[PDB]
């Protein structure tokens, strides 16, 4: 196995395949075949594959080398470096200028494969749309819930919409985007690690994203990268059941103003429970906080509100999380009563909605 490639062609691919990819799981699989270098990393649950065209003379073969070391060596080389590589003995030799490195290898035959599977559902969409779907909901995923499926993200197709849903039982996020293709009705749960990877592979170019879903796997193609992940089994909660049936008390406020008011009040909230009280009245919101040390915060804001007066408690971090995710100009809070959840949305868009359950 021999290749010679410019540093600038290896770097992004090495970076993409290298996170996080027992010993052999810390190696990358390198394969030279049919004018292409393929680089593969896996953790057994998921897999990233990059392809690199070889325009310089090369020779076929495969090996496996430590991922961090190989990436750190390539990255440490100077701008415009050419990186010549050849297998030799039980070692892989890397040359550039008068820098020489000899890396240990494990057999390509030892490198694990994900089981083969069949695509059942397929669609294409813009990078920016997938970025939008994930960033809108990611923060509402559970971290280490005993209900494992809540630790991932639901991806749902309905009509011509792709939808993400994330929830931890206390708060929920849902975002739906049109993708201009007739889809089957279908839902899968992607583990949190897969969501992180799916997000990482979106470079922000004009390269579209091609998705393939099997019964137990999901695959995303963008540019010369193919990411595959196993799915999570379980009964993900239905966001339709969670959205308030009729939250006809409508409050609108400036997002930055509302956020910074909650942020200040939060300073004097209980350090563990983080409770704040909202008092809504005619075109006014009062936010209060206090803690066991009898310290007290009070914020008063002008808002648009015509409905009946009410009082309601929330974990302030949940509210702040929504506002930070929204990045809006104006926000609408849609209320029911003191003991029911609140729906929160950007006043200008209904593409995303957030539901937060109150505290007593």
């Amino acid at each position: 196995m021999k290749f010679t490639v410019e540093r600038e062609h290896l770097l992004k691919p090495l970076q993409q395949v290298s996170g996080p990819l027992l010993p052999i799981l810390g190696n990358l699989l390198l394969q030279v075949a049919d004018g292409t270098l393929s680089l593969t990393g896996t953790d057994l649950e998921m897999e990233m594959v990059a392809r690199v065209a070889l325009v310089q003379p090369h020779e076929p073969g495969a090996t496996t080398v430590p991922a961090r070391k190989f990436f750190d060596i390539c990255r440490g080389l100077p701008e415009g470096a050419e990186i010549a590589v050849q297998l030799e003995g039980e070692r892989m030799l890397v040359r550039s200028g008068r820098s020489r490195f000899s890396l240990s290898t494990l057999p390509a035959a030892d490198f694990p494969n994900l089981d083969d599977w069949q695509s059942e559902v397929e669609f294409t969409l813009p990078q920016a749309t997938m970025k939008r779907l994930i960033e809108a909901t990611q923060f509402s995923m559970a971290h280490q819930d005993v209900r494992y499926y809540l630790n991932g993200m639901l991806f749902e197709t309905e009509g011509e919409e792709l939808r993400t849903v994330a929830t931890d039982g206390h708060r929920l996020a849902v975002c739906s985007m049109p993708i201009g293709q007739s889809l089957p009705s279908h839902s899968v749960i992607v583990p949190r690690k897969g969501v992180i990877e799916l997000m990482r592979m979106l470079d922000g170019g004009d390269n579209p994203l091609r998705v393939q879903i099997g019964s137990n796997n999901i695959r995303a193609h963008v540019g010369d990268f193919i990411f595959t992940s196993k799915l999570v089994d379980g009964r993900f909660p239905d966001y339709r059941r969670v959205l308030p049936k009729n939250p006809d008390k409508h409050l609108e406020a400036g997002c930055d103003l509302l956020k910074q008011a909650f942020a200040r009040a939060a300073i004097l909230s209980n350090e563990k429970f983080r409770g704040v009280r909202l008092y809504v009245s005619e075109n006014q919101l009062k936010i209060t906080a206090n803690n066991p040390e009898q310290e007290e915060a009070e914020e008063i804001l002008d808002v648009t509100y015509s409905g009946a007066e009410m009082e309601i408690g929330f974990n302030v971090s949940y509210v702040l999380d929504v506002l930070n995710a929204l990045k809006c100009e104006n926000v609408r809070m849609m209320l029911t009563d003191s003991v029911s959840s609140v729906q929160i949305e950007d006043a200008a868009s209904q593409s995303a909605a957030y539901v937060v359950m109150p505290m007593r």
């Binding site: 929830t167 929920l172 059941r241 969670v242 959840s341 539901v355 109150p358």
Partner: peptide, 5 residues
Amino acid sequence: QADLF
């Protein structure tokens, strides 16, 4: 804290 489901 109350729950959604």
